[PDB]
Amino acid sequence: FACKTANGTAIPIGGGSANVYVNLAPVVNVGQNLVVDLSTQIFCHNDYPETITDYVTLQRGSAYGGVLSNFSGTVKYSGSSYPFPTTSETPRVVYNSRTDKPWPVALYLTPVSSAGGVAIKAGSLIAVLILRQTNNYNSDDFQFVWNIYANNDVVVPTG
Numbered sequence: 001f002a003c004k005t006a007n008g009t010a011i012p013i014g015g016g017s018a019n020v021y022v023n024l025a026p027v028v029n030v031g032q033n034l035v036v037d038l039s040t041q042i043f044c045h046n047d048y049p050e051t052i053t054d055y056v057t058l059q060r061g062s063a064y065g066g067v068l069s070n071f072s073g074t075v076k077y078s079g080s081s082y083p084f085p086t087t088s089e090t091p092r093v094v095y096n097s098r099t100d101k102p103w104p105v106a107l108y109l110t111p112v113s114s115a116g117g118v119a120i121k122a123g124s125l126i127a128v129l130i131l132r133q134t135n136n137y138n139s140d141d142f143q144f145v146w147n148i149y150a151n152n153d154v155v156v157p158t159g
């Protein structure tokens with residue numbers, strides 16, 4: 001089991017870390033969601049699906065910078081939504097193919113009532129998402145740590 005990103009980096013068997021750079025909607029209003037879709041950013045596969053089934057959770061999701069300061073919301077993982085920053089580990093998604101499969105994670109971030117102006121700065125760390133991989137074969141339990149950076153400023157209008 002290993003993963004790759006839309007910015008051309010990787011995390012091998014056994015886990016590790018990578019950086020992910022996301023384009024964000026430049027304007028988000030109070031009462032609306034900024035969507036951060038990681039399913040177009042992070043992809044993984046099973047290295048021996050003939051025998052082994054891989055299990056993958058979102059173990060932890062943490063907010064940073066302008067997201068921590070200026071937003072609240074949820075994370076959608078494989079069709080169900082949970083609070084973000086996270087408060088527990090999600091259920092598992094199965095990986096059972098050598099073909100790349102997206103990691104089905106998206107953040108839905110809504111501005112806090114006091115937010116206004118540049119609420120997320122270009123280049124800044126916005127989140128750290130930990131993917132936990134186990135399997136039905138051995139005792140492997142590996143963390144794939146995804147450091148999520150904004151490529152651009154996000155503004156919350158004062159109207």
Ligand SMILES: N#Cc1ccc(-c2ccc(O[C@H]3O[C@H](CO)[C@@H](O)[C@H](O)[C@@H]3O)c(Cl)c2)cc1
Binds near residue numbers: 002013014052054
């Ligand atoms: N014959 C034969 C043969 C026996 C074992 C393996 C083999 C290949 C990869 C293996 O392990 C890697 O891939 C697994 C599947 O994604 C993951 O569950 C593991 O955590 C690890 O990343 C492990 Cl155990 C075993 C490949 C071929």
